[PDB]
Every structure is written in structure tokens, then in C-alpha cells.
Short mmCIF file of C-alpha atoms and ligand atoms in Angstrom, two decimals:
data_model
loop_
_atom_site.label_atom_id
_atom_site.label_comp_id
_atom_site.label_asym_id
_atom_site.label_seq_id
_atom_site.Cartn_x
_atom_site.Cartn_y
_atom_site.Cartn_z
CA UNK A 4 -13.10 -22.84 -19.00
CA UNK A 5 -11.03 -20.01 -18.42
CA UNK A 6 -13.06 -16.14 -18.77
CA UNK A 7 -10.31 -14.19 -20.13
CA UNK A 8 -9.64 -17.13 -22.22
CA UNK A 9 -12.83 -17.14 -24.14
CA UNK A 10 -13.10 -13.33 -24.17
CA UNK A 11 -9.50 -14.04 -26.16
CA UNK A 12 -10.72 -16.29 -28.57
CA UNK A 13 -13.77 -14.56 -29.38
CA UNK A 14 -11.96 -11.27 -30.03
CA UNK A 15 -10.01 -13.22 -32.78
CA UNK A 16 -12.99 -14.54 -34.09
CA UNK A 17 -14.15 -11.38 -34.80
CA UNK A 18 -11.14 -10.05 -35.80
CA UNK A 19 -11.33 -12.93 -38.22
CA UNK A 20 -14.11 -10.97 -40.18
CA UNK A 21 -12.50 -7.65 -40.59
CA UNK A 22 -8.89 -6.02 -41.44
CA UNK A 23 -6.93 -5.23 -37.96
CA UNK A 24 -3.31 -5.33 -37.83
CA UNK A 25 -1.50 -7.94 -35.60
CA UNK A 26 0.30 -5.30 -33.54
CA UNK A 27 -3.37 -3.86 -32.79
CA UNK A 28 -5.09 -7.09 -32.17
CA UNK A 29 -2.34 -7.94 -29.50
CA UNK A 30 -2.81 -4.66 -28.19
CA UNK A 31 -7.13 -5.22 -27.36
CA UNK A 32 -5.55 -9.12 -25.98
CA UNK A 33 -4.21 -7.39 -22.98
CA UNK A 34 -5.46 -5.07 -20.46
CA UNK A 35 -4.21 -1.74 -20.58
CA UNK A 36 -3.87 -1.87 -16.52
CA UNK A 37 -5.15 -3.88 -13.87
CA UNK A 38 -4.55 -3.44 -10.11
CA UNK A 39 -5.31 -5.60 -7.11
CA UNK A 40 -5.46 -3.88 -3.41
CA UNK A 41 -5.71 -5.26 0.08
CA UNK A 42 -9.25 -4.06 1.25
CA UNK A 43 -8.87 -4.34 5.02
CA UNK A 44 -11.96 -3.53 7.39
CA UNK A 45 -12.97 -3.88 10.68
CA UNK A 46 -15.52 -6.37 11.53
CA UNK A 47 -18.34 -5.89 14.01
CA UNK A 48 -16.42 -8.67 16.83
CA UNK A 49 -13.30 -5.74 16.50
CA UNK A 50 -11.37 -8.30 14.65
CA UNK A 51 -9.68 -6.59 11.00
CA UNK A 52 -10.39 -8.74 7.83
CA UNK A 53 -8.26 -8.09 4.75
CA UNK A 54 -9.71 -8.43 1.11
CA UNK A 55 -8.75 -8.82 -1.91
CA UNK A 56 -9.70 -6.39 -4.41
CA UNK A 57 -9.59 -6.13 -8.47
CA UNK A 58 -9.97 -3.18 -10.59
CA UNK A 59 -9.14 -3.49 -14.46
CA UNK A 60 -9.07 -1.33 -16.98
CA UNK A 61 -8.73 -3.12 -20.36
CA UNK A 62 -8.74 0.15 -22.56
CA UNK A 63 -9.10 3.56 -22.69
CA UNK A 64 -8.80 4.87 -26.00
CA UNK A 65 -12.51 6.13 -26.64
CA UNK A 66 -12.18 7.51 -23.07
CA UNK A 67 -12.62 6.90 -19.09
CA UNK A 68 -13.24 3.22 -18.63
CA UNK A 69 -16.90 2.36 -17.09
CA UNK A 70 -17.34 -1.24 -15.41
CA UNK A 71 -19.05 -2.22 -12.59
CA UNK A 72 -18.05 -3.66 -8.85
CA UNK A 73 -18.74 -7.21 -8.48
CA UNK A 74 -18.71 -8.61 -4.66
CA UNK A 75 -18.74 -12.61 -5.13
CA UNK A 76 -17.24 -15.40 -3.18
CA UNK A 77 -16.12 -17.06 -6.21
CA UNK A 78 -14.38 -14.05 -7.48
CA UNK A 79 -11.41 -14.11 -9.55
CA UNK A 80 -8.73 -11.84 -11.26
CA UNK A 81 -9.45 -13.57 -14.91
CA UNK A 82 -13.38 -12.87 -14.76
CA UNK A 83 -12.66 -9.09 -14.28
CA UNK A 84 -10.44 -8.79 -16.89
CA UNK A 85 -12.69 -10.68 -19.33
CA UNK A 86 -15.58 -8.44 -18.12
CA UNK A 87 -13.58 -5.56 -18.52
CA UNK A 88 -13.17 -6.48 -22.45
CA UNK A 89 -16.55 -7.39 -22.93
CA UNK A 90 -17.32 -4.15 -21.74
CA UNK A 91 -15.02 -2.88 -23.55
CA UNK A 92 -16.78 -3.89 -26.72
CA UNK A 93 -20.30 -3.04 -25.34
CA UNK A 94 -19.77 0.68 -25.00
CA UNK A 95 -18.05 1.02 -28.24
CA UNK A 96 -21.07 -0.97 -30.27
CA UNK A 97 -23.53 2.28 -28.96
CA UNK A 98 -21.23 4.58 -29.62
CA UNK A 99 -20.02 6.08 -26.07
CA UNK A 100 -17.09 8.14 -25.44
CA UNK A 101 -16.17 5.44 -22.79
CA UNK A 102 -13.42 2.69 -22.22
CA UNK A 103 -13.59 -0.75 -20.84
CA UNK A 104 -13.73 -1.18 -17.27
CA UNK A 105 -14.08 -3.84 -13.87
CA UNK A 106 -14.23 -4.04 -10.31
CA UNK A 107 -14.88 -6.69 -7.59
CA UNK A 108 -13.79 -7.83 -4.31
CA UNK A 109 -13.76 -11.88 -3.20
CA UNK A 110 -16.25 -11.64 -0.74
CA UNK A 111 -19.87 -13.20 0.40
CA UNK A 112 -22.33 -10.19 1.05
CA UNK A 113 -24.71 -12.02 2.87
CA UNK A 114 -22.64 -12.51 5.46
CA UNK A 115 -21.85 -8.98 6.35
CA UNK A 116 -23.69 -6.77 7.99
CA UNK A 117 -24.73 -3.28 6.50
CA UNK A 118 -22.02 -1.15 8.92
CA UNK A 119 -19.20 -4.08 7.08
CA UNK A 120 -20.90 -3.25 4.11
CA UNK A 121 -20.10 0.30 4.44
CA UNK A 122 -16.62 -0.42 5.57
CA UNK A 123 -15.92 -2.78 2.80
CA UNK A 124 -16.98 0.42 0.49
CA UNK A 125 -15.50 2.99 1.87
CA UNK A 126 -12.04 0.89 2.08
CA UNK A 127 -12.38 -0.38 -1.45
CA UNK A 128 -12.45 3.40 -2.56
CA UNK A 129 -9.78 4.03 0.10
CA UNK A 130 -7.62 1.46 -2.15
CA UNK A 131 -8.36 2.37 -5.72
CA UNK A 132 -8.59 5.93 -5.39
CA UNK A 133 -5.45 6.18 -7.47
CA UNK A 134 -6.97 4.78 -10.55
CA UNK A 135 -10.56 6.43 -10.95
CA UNK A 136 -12.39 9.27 -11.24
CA UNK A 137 -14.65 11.48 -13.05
CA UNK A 138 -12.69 11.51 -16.36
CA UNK A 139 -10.24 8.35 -15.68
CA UNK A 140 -12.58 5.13 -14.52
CA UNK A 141 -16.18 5.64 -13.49
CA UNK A 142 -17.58 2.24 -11.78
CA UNK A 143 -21.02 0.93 -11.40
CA UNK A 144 -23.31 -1.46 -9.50
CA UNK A 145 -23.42 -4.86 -10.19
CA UNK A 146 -24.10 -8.40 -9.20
CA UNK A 147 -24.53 -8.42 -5.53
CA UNK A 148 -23.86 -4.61 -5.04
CA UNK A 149 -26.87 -1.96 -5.07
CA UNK A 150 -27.13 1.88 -5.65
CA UNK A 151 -26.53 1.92 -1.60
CA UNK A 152 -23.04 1.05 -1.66
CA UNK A 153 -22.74 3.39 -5.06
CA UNK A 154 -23.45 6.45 -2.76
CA UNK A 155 -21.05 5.36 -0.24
CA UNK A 156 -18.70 4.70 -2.83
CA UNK A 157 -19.52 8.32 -3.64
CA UNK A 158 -19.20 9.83 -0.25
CA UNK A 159 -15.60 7.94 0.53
CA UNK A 160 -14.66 9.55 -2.56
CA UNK A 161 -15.83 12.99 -2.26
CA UNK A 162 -14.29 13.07 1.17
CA UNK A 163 -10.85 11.77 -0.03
CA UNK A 164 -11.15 13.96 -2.84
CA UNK A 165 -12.21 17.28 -0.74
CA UNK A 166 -14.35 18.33 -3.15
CA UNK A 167 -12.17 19.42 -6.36
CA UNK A 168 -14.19 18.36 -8.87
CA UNK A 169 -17.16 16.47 -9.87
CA UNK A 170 -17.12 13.65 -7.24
CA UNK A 171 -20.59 13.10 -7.98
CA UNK A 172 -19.98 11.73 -11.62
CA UNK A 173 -17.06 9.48 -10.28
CA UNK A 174 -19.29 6.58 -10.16
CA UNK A 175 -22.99 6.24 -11.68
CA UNK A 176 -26.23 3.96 -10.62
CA UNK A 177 -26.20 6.53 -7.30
CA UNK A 178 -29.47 7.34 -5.91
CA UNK A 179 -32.20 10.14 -6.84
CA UNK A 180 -30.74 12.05 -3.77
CA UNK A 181 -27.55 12.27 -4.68
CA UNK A 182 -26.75 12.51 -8.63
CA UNK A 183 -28.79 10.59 -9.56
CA UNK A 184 -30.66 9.58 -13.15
CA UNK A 185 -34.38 8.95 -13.86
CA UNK A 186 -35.06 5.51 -15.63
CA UNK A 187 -31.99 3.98 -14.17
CA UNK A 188 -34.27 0.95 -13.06
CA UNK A 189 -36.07 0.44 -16.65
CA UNK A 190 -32.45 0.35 -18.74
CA UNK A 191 -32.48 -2.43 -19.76
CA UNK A 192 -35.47 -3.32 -20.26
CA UNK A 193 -36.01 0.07 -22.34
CA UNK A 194 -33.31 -0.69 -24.57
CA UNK A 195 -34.35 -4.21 -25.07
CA UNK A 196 -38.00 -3.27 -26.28
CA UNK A 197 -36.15 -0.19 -28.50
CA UNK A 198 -34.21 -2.54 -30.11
CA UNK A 199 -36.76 -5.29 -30.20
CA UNK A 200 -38.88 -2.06 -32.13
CA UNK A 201 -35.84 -1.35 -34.99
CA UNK A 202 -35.93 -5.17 -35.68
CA UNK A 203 -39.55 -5.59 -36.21
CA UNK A 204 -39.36 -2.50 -38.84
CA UNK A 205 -35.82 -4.14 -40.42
CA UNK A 206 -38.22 -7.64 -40.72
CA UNK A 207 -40.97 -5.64 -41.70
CA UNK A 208 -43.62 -6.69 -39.04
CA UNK A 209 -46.25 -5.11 -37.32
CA UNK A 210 -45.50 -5.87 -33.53
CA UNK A 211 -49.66 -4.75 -32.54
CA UNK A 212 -51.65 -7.85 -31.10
CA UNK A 213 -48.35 -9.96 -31.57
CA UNK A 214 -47.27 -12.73 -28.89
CA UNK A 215 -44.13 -12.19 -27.02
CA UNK A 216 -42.57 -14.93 -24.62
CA UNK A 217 -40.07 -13.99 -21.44
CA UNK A 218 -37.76 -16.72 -19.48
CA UNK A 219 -36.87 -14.96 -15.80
CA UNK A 220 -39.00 -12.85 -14.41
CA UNK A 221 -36.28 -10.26 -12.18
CA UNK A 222 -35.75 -7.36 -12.87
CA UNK A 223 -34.93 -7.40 -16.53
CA UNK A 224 -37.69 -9.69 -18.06
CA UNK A 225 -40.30 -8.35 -15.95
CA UNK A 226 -40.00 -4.45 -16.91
CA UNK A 227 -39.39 -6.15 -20.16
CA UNK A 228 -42.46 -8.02 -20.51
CA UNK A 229 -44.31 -4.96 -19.32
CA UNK A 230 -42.64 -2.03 -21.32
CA UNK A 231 -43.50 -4.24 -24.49
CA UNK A 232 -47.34 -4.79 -23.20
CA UNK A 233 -47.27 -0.80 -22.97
CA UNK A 234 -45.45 0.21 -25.61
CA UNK A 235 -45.60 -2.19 -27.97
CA UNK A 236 -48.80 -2.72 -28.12
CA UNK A 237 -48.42 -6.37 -27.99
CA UNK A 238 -49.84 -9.72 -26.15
CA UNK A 239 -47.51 -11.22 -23.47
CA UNK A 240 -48.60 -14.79 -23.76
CA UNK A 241 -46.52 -16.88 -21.34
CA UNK A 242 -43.80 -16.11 -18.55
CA UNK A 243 -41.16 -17.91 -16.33
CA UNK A 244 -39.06 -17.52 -13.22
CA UNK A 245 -36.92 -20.11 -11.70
CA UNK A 246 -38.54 -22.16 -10.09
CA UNK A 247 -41.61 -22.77 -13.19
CA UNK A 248 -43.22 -21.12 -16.12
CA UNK A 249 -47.11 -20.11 -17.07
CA UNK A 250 -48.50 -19.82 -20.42
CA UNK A 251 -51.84 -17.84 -21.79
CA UNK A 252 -53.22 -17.89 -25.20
CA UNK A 253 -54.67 -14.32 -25.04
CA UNK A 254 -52.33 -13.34 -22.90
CA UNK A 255 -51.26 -11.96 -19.28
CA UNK A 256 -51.02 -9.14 -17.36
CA UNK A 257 -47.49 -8.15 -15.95
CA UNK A 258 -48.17 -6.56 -13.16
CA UNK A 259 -50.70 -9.19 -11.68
CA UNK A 260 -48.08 -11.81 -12.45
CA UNK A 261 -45.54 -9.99 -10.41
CA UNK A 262 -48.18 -9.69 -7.53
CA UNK A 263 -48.81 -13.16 -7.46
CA UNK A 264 -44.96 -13.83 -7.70
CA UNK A 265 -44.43 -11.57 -4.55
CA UNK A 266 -47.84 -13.33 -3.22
CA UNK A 267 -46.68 -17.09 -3.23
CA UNK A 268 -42.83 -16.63 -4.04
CA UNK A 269 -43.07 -17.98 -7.63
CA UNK A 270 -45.31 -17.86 -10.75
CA UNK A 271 -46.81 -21.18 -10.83
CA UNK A 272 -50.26 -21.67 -10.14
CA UNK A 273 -51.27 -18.33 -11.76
CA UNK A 274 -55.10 -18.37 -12.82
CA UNK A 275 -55.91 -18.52 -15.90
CA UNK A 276 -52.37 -20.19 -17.18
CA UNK A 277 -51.12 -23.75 -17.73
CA UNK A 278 -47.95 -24.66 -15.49
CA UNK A 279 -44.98 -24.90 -17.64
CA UNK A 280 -41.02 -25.51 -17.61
CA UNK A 281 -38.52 -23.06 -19.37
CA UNK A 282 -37.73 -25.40 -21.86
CA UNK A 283 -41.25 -25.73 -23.03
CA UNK A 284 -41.31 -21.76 -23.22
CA UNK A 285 -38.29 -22.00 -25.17
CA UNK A 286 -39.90 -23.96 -28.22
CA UNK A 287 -42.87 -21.98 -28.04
CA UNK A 288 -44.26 -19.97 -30.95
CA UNK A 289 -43.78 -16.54 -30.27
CA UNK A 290 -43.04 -13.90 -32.93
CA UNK A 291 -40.33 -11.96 -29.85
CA UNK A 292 -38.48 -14.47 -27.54
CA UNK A 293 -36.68 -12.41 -24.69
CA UNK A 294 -34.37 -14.96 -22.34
CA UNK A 295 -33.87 -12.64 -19.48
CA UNK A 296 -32.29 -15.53 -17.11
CA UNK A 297 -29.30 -17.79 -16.38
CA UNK A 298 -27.45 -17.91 -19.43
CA UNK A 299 -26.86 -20.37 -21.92
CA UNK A 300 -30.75 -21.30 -22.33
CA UNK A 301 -30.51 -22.27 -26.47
CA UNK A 302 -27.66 -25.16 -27.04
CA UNK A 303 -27.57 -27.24 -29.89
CA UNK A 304 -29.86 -29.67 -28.25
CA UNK A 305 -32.92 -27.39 -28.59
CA UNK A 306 -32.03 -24.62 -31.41
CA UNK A 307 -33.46 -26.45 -33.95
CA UNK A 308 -36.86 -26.42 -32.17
CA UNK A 309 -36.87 -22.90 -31.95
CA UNK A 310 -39.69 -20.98 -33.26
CA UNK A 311 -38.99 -17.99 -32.02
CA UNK A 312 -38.74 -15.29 -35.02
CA UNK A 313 -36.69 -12.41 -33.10
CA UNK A 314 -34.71 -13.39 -30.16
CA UNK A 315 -33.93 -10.76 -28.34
CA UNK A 316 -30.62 -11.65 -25.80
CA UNK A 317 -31.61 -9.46 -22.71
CA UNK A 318 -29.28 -11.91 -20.71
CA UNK A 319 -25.77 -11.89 -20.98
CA UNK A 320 -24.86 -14.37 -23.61
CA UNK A 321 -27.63 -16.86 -23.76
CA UNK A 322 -27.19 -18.63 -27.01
CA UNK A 323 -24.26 -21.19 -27.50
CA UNK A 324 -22.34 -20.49 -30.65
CA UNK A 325 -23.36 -23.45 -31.92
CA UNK A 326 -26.93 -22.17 -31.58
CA UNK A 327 -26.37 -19.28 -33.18
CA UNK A 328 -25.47 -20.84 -36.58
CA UNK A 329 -28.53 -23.23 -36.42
CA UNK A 330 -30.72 -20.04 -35.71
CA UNK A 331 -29.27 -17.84 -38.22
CA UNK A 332 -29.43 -21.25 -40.88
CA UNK A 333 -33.32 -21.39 -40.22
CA UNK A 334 -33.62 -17.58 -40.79
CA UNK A 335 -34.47 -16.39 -37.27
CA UNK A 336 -32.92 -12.55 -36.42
CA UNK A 337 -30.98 -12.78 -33.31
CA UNK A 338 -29.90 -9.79 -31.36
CA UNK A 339 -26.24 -9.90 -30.04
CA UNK A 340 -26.52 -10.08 -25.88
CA UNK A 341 -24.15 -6.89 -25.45
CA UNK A 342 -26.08 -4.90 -27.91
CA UNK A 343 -29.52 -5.54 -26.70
CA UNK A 344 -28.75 -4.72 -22.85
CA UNK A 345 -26.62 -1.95 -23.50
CA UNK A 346 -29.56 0.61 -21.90
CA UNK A 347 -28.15 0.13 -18.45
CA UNK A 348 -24.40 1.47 -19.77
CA UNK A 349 -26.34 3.90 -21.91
CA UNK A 350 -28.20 5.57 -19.15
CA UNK A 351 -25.24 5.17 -16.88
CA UNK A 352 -23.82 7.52 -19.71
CA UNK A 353 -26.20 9.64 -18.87
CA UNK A 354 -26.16 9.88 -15.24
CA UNK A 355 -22.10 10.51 -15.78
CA UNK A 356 -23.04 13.29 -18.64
CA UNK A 357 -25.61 15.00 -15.83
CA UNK A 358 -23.08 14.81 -12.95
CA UNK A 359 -20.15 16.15 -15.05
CA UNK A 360 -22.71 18.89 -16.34
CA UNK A 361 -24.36 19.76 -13.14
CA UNK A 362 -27.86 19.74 -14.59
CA UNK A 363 -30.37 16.91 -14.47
CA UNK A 364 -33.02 16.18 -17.16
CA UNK A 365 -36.26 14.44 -17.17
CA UNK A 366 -37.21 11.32 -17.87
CA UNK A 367 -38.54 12.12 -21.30
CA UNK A 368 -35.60 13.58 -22.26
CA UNK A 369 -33.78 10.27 -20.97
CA UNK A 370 -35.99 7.79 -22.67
CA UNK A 371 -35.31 9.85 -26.26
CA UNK A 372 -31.58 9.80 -26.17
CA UNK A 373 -32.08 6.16 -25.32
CA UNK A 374 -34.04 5.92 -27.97
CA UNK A 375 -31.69 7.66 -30.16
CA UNK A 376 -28.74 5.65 -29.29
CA UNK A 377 -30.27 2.24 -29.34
CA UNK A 378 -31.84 2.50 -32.44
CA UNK A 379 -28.91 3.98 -33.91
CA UNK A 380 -26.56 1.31 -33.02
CA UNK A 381 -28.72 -1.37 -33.72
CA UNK A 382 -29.39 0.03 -37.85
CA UNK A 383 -25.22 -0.26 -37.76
CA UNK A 384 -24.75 -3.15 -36.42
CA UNK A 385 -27.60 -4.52 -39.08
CA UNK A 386 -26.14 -2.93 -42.15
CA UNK A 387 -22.94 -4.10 -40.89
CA UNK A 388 -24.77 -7.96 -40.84
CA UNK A 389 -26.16 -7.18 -44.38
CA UNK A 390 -22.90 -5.74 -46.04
CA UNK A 391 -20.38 -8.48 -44.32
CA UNK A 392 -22.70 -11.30 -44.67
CA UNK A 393 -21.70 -12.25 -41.16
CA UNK A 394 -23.73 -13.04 -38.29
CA UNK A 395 -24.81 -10.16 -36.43
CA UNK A 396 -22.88 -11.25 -33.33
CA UNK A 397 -20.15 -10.88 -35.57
CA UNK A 398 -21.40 -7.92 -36.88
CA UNK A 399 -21.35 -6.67 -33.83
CA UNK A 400 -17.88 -7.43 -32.75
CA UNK A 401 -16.87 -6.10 -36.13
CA UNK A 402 -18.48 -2.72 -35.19
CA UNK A 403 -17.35 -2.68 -31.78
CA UNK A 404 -13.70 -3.41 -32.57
CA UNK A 405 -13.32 -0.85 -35.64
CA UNK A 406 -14.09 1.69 -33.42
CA UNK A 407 -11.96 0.89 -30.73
CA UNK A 408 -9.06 0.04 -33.38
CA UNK A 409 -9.49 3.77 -34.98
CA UNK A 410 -9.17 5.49 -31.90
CA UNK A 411 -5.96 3.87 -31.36
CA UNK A 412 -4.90 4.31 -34.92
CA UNK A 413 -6.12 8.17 -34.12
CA UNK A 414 -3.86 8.39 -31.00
CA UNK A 415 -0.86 6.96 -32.68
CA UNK A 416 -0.53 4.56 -30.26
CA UNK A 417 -0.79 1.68 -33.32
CA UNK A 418 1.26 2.53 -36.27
CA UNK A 419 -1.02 0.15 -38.62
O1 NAP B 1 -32.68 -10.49 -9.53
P1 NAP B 1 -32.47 -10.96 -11.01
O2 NAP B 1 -30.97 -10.99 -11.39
O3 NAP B 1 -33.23 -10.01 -11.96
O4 NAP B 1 -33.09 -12.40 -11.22
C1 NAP B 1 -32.71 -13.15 -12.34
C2 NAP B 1 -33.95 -13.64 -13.05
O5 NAP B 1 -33.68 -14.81 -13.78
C3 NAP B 1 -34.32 -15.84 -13.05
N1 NAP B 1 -33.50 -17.03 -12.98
C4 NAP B 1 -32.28 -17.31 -12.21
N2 NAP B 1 -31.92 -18.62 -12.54
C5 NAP B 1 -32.92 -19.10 -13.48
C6 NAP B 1 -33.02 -20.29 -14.08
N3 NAP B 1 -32.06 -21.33 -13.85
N4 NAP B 1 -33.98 -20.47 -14.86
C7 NAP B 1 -34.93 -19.63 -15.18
N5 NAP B 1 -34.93 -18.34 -14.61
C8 NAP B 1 -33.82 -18.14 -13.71
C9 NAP B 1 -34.68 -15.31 -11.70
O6 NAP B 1 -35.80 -15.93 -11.18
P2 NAP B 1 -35.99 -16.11 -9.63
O7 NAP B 1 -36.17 -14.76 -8.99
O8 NAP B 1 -37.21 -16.93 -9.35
O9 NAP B 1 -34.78 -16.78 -9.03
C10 NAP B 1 -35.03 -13.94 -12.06
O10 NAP B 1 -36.26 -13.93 -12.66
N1 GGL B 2 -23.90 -3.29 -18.30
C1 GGL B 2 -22.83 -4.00 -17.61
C2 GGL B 2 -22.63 -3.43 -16.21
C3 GGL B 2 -21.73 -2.21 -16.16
C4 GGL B 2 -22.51 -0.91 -16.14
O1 GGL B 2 -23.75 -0.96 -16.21
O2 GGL B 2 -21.87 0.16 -16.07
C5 GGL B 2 -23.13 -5.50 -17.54
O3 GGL B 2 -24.19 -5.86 -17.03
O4 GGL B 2 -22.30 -6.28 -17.98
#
């Protein structure tokens, strides 16, 4: 099924829920701009490869876009743009002075070598140098690219640029050394367990000594599982990776699971813990379920099963639609997937708000305003769920898109 397609259909869905002229709605279906380059480099035999390269920019009336680079082999034109809108929609739902934004080039990383790498950066920049910068498009690492080729990103920029400006805010997840932001490795996570927090107190339930289950252990569900531990206060019973899954009545300790995972590869065979699948995690009962994996985990064939009271959506749309309406029949409070993991834009907001500003805060100061914004857009997006009597996807999307919609109705650039 086609990306942009689907992106389509579920802006008129939500659309469907709230007042939104036609000339408007037409207006979010297309992307403002997009632009595809010829990336040419120079391989390591001599020989010159040629690229192709995407860079959309579905809207801009909030502000500069923000959107990450995505370097796949299975790349296509359709899967920025739908990105784009989606994240369109997730900085307007916290509230950002930002646009909607994507990047990526068709290529396989793992076959290039770091100095192709570097090339492939440097040339990308080289190509769409026209169409970002500090206050126009701001991009950001993603799937297969790292905070490495950020700062060479950076550097090609800055040197086309010859210093003008800002160069360091042009593009965000760049290392400590160079512009930098603390807690750009714990965004997600942070927002997760922040927003995890504000719908305990909306349920009314004490999170302390409470069981909390995780599917994928990267990044995401591991600083998850361990920020809640911490913060929370509260028992991580079971885990998962990949390849199996563990679960612990008392509970488990985080870090020693991620030792053993970098021990042996995988998180089976842990002591103390039963061997388990993801499915069987999925059905267990936990007050907070997290999925922070391969998406689509709850269909219609297991929803009903679930026990899960809050499901958090770390992941990137996890839940089939479907699934949503059995969970929301049985009473469960779900947590839209581009409102819970919208602490890695967030603190990329940040990192763009230090660079413009030239002064760097702590990471106290970081974790607050996270704070701040998180649990500020996730008390709209819940009133918005209580008032509309809508789910709080489509609460969500309702939120999002009435933003977006009055800052074009503010520009004049939609007469209704
Ligand atoms: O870097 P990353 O991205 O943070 O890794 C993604 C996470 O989701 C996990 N994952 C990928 N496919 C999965 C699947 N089909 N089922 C359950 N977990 C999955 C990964 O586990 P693995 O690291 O084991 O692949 C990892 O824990
Ligand atoms: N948060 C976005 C990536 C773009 C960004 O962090 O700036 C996503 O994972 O869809």
C-alpha cells in the first residue's frame, strides 16, 4: 500500500472529526515543495556513482520544516513525502514553531565505506543547499544515518555557507563537540515515561511498585524500561528483543538485561526469567505496555486479549486501526504513536533553539522543558479526547491539524 496514500486518507479521517474547509484540506494533501537532486560521489575504485536524492517539505506555515535524512535501499519519493506529513502533524501536536519536513537518498550504507560516507554527505548538502537552513529546513538523523554524518552535514554546510549565520543550527542531532544538546540519546524514551506519568494521574493511578512490560529492547525500549524503573518508581517485569522475550514476577533489572544482551547477542536465557515470545508479552498483564519495536504488533487478531491498561506507542504506529477501536471499546487508554515519541523532535527543538541562540543549557534545564512540553500536549490532546468524544488518535490529529489550519488561516494563504 502506497505511504503517501495512507498519510492521505488518514488526514481526511481526521479532518472528518473537526470543521476545515475543502480549499484548506487540499492544501495539507499536497506538499508545499519537494525536490529530488543527483548526489554524485566518488567511490574508493575512482569510479563516480550518482544518487538519487529526496528532500520534501510538506508545510511551512508554523515555521522552518524539521525532518530527518533517511539512507535506505528501498527508498522512495512517496515515503518521504508521507513522512514529511506525518511530521508535519507531530511537531504541531507539541506545539513547536516548526513545519513538516524529509530527506533520504536510495542507497545501502553498509556497503560504503566511511570516506563514501562522507562523500555521500557532503554531496547531498552540496545538492540541497538551496532549500535549507537555519530558519528554512533544519534536517535530522534517522534510520541508517548517525550524529556522524549530522556533523559532516554541518561542516559541508558551514563551508558552502562561509560562515554568515548560524550554520551550526542548520541541522540538529550533531555531536557534544559541535552544537550539540544534552539528553539527545534519552528523547524518546524521556518523553515516553513523561507522558506515560500525565496518563497515570488522568486514570488516577499510582504508578509506585506497578508492573510495566517493553517489546524491543534498542534504543528506545531499553532507556524506556530503565527511565521508568528510575523515575517511576515502578517494577519492570518482563522484556523482549527480536530474536525472544523474558519475563519476571518481581521484576528485572535494565541494565543487567542489556549486559547480558551485549554478553550473548540476545535476551534469552536471562537468569532468573522464563523464555518468552512477543506475542505472549503482548497479552500479558501489565498496568503500562510500551511496544518499542517493528510496528504493527496489536491487529485485530490479538486486541481483544489485551490486558494492557495504558499502552504507550513508543514505536511508530504500532496498533492497527482496527485495534484501536477494540482497545478503546474495552476501556484501555492508548497513547497516539506521534505524540508519545515526540521527545526526540522536542529536544531536537532544543538543540536548534541553543544553536540559533549561541548558548547551551544543562541537562536539567533540558529534561524540564521536556517535561513542560510533553505534559502539556498530552493534557490537550486528552481534553480534546474528552470534549470530542473521539479517540485520542483522533484527538490528536484534530489538535495537530487545527493548528496547522490557523496558521494558514493567519497568513491568508486560506481564505476559509
Ligand atoms: O536499533 P533499534 O532501532 O533501537 O532496534 C529496534 C528494536 O526493536 C527490536 N526489533 C526489531 N524487529 C523486531 C521484531 N520483529 N520483534 C521484536 N523486536 C524487534 C530490535 O531488537 P534487536 O536489536 O534484537 O534486533 C530492537 O530492540
Ligand atoms: N522524530 C522523527 C524524526 C525526525 C526528527 O527527530 O527530527 C521520527 O522518528 O519520525
Amino acid at each position: 500500500i502506497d505511504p503517501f496514500e495512507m498519510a492521505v486518507k488518514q488526514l481526511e479521517r481526521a479532518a472528518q472529526y473537526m470543521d476545515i474547509s475543502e480549499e484548506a484540506l487540499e492544501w495539507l494533501k499536497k506538499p508545499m515543495r519537494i525536490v529530488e537532486v543527483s548526489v554524485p560521489i566518488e567511490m574508493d575504485d575512482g569510479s563516480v556513482k550518482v544518487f538519487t536524492g529526496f528532500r520534501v517539505q510538506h508545510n511551512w506555515a508554523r515555521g522552518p520544516t524539521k525532518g530527518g535524512i533517511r539512507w535506505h535501499p528501498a527508498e522512495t519519493l512517496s515515503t518521504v513525502k508521507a513522512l514529511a506529513t506525518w511530521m508535519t502533524w507531530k511537531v504541531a501536536v507539541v506545539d513547536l514553531p516548526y513545519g513538516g519536513g524529509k530527506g533520504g537518498i536510495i542507497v545501502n550504507p553498509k556497503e560504503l565505506s566511511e570516506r563514501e560516507q562522507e562523500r555521500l554527505a557532503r554531496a547531498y548538502i552540496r545538492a540541497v543547499y538551496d532549500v535549507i537552513g537555519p530558519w528554512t529546513d533544519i534536517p535530522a538523523p534517522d534510520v541508517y544515518t548517525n550524529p556522524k554524518i549530522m556533523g559532516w552535514m554541518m561542516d559541508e554546510y558551514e563551508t558552502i555557507m562561509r560562515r554568515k549565520g548560524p550554520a551550526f543550527g542548520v541541522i540538529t542531532g550533531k555531536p557534544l563537540s559541535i552544537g550539540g544538546s544534552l539528553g539527545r540519546g534519552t528523547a524518546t524514551a524521556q518523553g515516553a515515561i513523561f507522558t506515560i506519568r500525565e496518563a497515570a494521574k488522568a486514570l488516577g493511578i499510582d504508578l509506585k511498585g506497578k508492573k510495566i512490560a517493553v517489546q524491543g529492547y534498542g534504543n528506545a525500549g531499553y532507556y524506556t524500561a530503565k527511565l521508568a524503573k528510575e523515575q517511576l518508581g515502578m517494577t519492570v517485569v518482563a522484556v523482549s528483543d527480536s530474536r525472544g522475550g523474558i519475563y519476571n514476577p518481581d521484576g528485572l533489572d535494565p541494565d543487567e538485561v542489556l549486559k547480558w544482551k551485549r554478553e550473548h547477542g540476545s535476551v534469552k536465557d536471562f537468569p532468573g526469567a522464563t523464555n518468552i515470545t512477543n506475542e505472549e508479552l503482548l497479552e500479558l498483564e501489565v498496568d503500562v505496555l510500551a511496544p518499542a519495536a517493528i510496528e504493527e504488533v496489536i491487529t485485530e487478531k490479538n486486541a481483544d486479549n489485551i490486558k494492557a491498561k495504558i499502552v504507550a506507542e513508543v514505536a511508530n504506529g504500532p496498533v492497527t486501526p482496527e485495534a484501536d477501536d477494540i482497545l478503546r471499546e474495552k476501556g484501555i487508554l492508548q497513547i497516539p504513536d506521534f505524540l508519545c515519541n515526540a521527545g526526540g523532535v522536542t529536544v531536537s527543538y532544543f538543540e536548534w533553539v541553543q544553536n540559533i541562540n549561541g548558548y547551551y543549557w544543562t541537562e536539567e534545564e533540558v529534561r524540564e522543558k521536556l517535561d513542560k512540553k510533553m505534559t502539556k500536549a498530552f493534557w490537550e490532546v486528552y481534553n480534546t479526547h474528552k470534549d470530542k468524544n473521539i479517540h485520542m488518535r483522533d484527538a490528536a490529529y484534530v489538535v495537530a491539524v487545527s493548528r496547522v489550519y490557523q496558521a494558514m488561516k493567519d497568513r491568508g494563504w486560506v481564505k476559509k
